[PDB]
Ligand binder design. Structure first.
Ligand SMILES: [Zn+2]
Lengths: 148, 64, 50, 363
């Protein structure tokens, strides 16, 4: 049951749509609720997409990640497992590794990930102190303007 | 003029290098020793002296 | 573009080091450099005896 | 483990067996703390940590901003979740605060009423912990990279200080005498450590890629110079007999003091017979470090021995005498500067450049 999942994720991300097309996202929701190892398979798909060089694709992958984060708990544990790399790939904190083009999609990625991280700090911060560490590090060490 | 300045944090002489990214209107001053970094807006009239200045000012303001 | 991850970014080159570097130069590399070893060796350009 | 308890009850195994086996099992199960937190007060990276040797309750932390924070590690609250609160603080408003980064802080052994802190402001300050005022200051002509008091000396109270000068200073707490120096290094002395076994044995590691053991009572220089090859590449001693192929920026005697762990900038850690400096050829693989200053790493105690080395933004846990890599403690966001091991409960406290002190507890 991995073929259809890789497919559906590929049409979701490669399309470059401004907003998630709803019914196939609902199919992803159902089939990700189906099994836990296959939810984590979707997580690896997202991680592999997020490294790839396009800001729109990075945006689609991050928005899927946010959907699963607000929707799944084992997903929250799994992503906080490597929140450091997640921040390196989303926020582009590291100077050596810059976010890939276009500039508009990269800016939208920055805004969306800042606000999603704010929401995650408010909602799941106490249950995941490593999320609190990441939020604090972003807010002081990187001086990310959360008011922007 | 001087382009390498003493770091306010580690007091190592000429250990601070200044990078003027004019395309983004931002100056980045970094100490090679203690790895302290600071970013300030810059204009076309700005110089490493004014980035080094904004860094000292930010330090003194934050230390109040 | 230092050979190793960290060796030294900038060093002060003392005359003593230059003397050894020049003394290692071969009698053929000196001739290629236009310095006949019989009459002038590169290390002789460093003042050791005044 | 019920086998362990049964063997202890029936006398089959000495309680030593259960104690050290369970200590080792706890260290292996080291993980990011589920219910513990450490108060954040340093504005800059934490360069050093030190839990007091007696009662293991209080922890000192020196930050890159020059402040020194004194934490209480005990869970005096009734909840399972607690934050290690900060008892005291040499903050920016203290009259005697260090002007630059504090690079080493150490509790006075044999008593918690005094501690010491050395900074890149060229000062080794001795603080009364009760009044929180500088009892003494020792100024140096060049920045201090590390310092260490003997954890064993009931007789002497010397502080060995390694600065960017090529000389190891010995500052006597008794009759304030900082004149004593040891000659034989050639570049900055990035680490110094007294032997826990022998009272007057001091190991010093310097940027000249050499580690020297000194009997400070002696008048004839270093006792031993550590050599990678032990004699395979033998030369008249002017530049050979190097401990590493880079700067040796960290020292740590093992718990018994019979071996010495040296970490250098050649991405290598080595284990040395502390009695004749012979390399034991324990591998350890590649230990990533590029720190231009001293690297603080510690060893475990009271277990069936581990070494916790900062490895990038992680803590690499190795078995000292086999070199087998246990694990990576992965919770820091920037390079880890120091890790200090609480031996009572097999806990770890790591300070890094991200202005965080993270506590690792057995799961
Ligand atoms: Zn600096």
């Amino acid at each position: 049951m991995d073929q259809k999942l890789s497919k559906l994720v590929e049409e979701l991300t490669t399309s470059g749509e401004p907003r998630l097309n709803p019914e196939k996202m609902k199919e992803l929701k159902k089939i990700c609720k189906s099994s836990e190892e296959q939810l984590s398979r979707a997580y690896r798909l997202l991680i592999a997409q997020l490294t790839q060089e396009h800001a729109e694709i990075r945006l689609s992958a991050f928005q899927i990640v946010e959907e699963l984060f607000v929707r799944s708990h084992q997903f929250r544990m799994l992503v906080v497992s490597n929140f450091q790399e997640f921040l390196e790939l989303t926020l582009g904190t590291d100077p050596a590794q810059p976010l890939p083009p276009p500039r508009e999609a990269a800016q939208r990625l920055r805004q969306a990930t800042t606000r999603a991280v704010e929401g995650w700090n408010e909602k799941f911060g106490e249950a995941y102190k490593k999320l609190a560490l990441g939020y604090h590090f972003l807010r002081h060490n990187k001086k990310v303007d959360f008011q922007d | 003029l001087e382009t390498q300045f003493t770091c306010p944090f580690c007091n190592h002489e000429k250990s601070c290098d200044v990078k003027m990214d004019r395309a983004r209107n931002t100056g980045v001053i970094s100490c090679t020793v203690c790895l302290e970094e600071f970013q300030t807006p810059i204009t076309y009239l700005s110089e490493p002296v004014d980035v080094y200045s904004d860094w000292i000012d930010a330090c003194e303001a934050a230390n109040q | 573009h230092v050979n190793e991850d960290s060796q030294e970014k900038k060093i002060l080159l003392s005359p003593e080091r230059v003397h050894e570097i020049f003394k290692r130069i071969s009698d053929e590399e000196c001739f290629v450099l236009g310095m006949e070893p019989r009459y002038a060796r590169p290390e002789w350009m460093i003042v050791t005896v005044l | 483990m019920l086998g362990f308890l049964s063997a202890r009850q029936t006398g089959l195994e000495d309680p030593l067996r259960l104690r050290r086996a369970e200590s080792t099992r706890r260290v292996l199960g080291l993980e990011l703390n589920k219910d513990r937190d450490v108060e954040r007060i340093h504005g800059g990276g934490i360069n050093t940590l030190d839990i007091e040797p007696v009662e293991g309750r209080y922890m000192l932390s020196g930050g890159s901003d020059g402040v020194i924070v004194l934490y209480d590690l005990e869970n005096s609250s009734r909840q399972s979740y607690y934050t290690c609160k900060a008892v005291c603080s040499i903050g920016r408003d203290h009259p005697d605060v260090h002007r630059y980064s504090v690079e080493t802080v150490q509790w006075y052994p044999h008593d918690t009423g005094m501690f010491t802190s050395s900074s890149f402001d060229k000062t080794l300050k001795v603080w009364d912990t009760n009044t929180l005022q500088t009892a003494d200051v020792f100024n140096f002509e060049e920045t201090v990279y590390s310092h260490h008091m003997s954890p064993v000396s009931t007789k002497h109270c010397l502080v060995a200080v390694g600065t960017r000068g090529p000389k190891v200073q010995l500052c006597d707490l008794k009759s304030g005498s900082c004149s004593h120096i040891l000659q034989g290094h050639r570049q900055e002395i990035l680490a110094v450590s007294w032997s826990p076994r022998y009272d007057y044995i001091l190991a010093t590691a310097s940027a000249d890629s050499r580690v020297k053991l000194w009997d400070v009572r002696r008048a004839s220089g270093c006792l031993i110079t550590l050599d990678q090859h032990n004699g395979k590449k033998s030369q008249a001693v002017e530049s050979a007999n190097t401990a590493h192929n880079g700067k040796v920026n960290g020292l740590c005697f093992t718990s018994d003091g019979l071996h010495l762990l040296t970490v250098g900038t050649d991405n290598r850690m080595r284990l040395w017979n502390s009695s004749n400096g012979e390399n034991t050829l324990v591998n350890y693989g590649k230990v990533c470090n590029n720190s231009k200053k001293g690297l603080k790493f510690t060893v475990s105690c009271g277990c069936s021995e581990f070494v916790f080395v900062p490895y990038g933004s992680t803590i690499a846990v190795y078995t000292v005498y086999s070199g087998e890599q246990i694990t990576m403690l992965k919770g820091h966001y920037k390079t880890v500067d120091c890790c200090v091991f609480q031996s009572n409960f097999q806990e770890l406290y790591s300070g890094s450049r991200d202005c965080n002190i993270l506590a690792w507890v057995p799961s």
